[PDB]
Amino acid sequence: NCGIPEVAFATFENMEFGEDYMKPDTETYNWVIQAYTRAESYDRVQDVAELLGLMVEDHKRLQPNMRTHVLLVECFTKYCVIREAIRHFRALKNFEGGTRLLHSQGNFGDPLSLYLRALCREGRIEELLDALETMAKDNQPIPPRAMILSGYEVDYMARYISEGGLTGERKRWVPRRGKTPLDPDVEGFIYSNPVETSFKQRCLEEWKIRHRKLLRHLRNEGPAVLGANASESDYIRVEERLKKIIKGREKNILKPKAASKMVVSELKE
Amino acid sequence: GAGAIREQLADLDLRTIIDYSFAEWKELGEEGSTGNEWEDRKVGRRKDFLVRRMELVKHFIRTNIEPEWMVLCLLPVLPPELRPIIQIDGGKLMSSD
């Protein structure tokens, strides 16, 4: 908690390459991870990748705890490495502290607001429900800061008494096009130094984009073995028609394949 | 003149530039091509252009430096003593270019 990241890293390097007793602990990695994820300037996501890699390699003595997943969820969500977050979130899921510690107080940019908001604006909605079930277990409610969005008059005349454009001269209602290296939107509240990406009305994205996994196997030769059939053109033709949207052809389950089996055979085959 | 260039530097939003260049990179990456040598080498230069564009824009976003400063308006002048005019006897002067 000093702002400058490379004042704690110098301490960490004094322990990683140190003697037997002064070797880094699981608490030590939490502090250095925390010191890098809340820097005031410059890109800092690559240095977090190193620390995770070093922690991964030294694993028979070091095991992750609740705060390690909490900080990794926060760090991977501020910059748009959402995938990398969802993964980690899961781990947190099986901790009795829940997202209350991940939320912490409203300070530090309210990381729980980031995870909820950033999941919605990208396309990941099924896991957003999974997140909401996890808060309902022990956590206090969804943060009000996490709930902010842009027949009846959408230009209400009723809200404008309760945000500043009212009898009170402090017109706190949002203006637009203010220039400067600031944010004219809200993108949460102010945080998440990148820009928010637009999920199209909770419509087409990440369902047609997920389908690329199905198309990945058919467009790839080595990952698919299949059988003999018509040499190596049976499954290829399925990819050819699947690229151009959908035109019937519900014949059968021609692919019926697995994804690399996570196997590492030494010699061959 | 340089006024329009500087104003344009002071106009475009960096985050929108990042989003648009990411979209262009995604569009370029989803094209097979590999049929013509001109087409073989055309995609690579544009992709490198996009990558250095987002690199520069992201560096600009999280720094204390504004783009408008590359089009300067006020010129500093080096101190006099470090560019002196040598006083020689008889009135000879060895000035600085």
Added chain:
Amino acid sequence: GSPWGFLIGAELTIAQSRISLVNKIQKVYRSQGVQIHNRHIEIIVRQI
């Protein structure tokens, strides 16, 4: 797989490049009667 595979490939390529470069450098000096320990060669080769 892809994550394992290129870790393996890059590590192999770096190893082979180091082994080739050390011998290639040292041959020129050994063909002219010049004796230098391999430490000085390897320090530069690692940075290469």
Added chain:
Amino acid sequence: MIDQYKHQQLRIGSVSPQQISAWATKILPNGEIVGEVTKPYTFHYKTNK
């Protein structure tokens, strides 16, 4: 064995015009600034002043 930490730094970047103005402009008690260097008067044709 805690090593002798020594954190030094050296930044570099383009300057804002306000930075140059603060660098050079010197305001006299009378209120004048006169940091513009209007004329290209290198040295007097008279005494070398």
Added chain:
Amino acid sequence: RTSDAGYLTRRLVEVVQHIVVRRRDCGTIRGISVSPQNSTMPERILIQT
């Protein structure tokens, strides 16, 4: 032939100038292994290695 040798010395040092022995054992277990009984290296290049 003495100018080119002088130029190479400038570039050789430039690559490695920050390389300083900063610590004792860094905790590595990967070690380059050599085979002296391959009868490939003479017992003057093998010894000096």
Added chain:
Amino acid sequence: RELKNRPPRRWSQEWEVELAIKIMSKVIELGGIPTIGDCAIILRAAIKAPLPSAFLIILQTTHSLGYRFGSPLYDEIITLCLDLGEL
């Protein structure tokens, strides 16, 4: 580990339509009210499937308006109006 190959589903709007009453449960288990972005979004999320649920119940707290008129229920052969009777 199993997630690496399972096909979750195709497009199907049955639980996302039920999300409005689901988030209502998941938020009013504690201090929070689904409104503005979860009430003025209901009028655009109401017409998804021929199921009145999660739409006629939005008026329990305040709304009682929908999109200004309530013509649904009286616009779906499916099964006849299953005794809406908002009263």
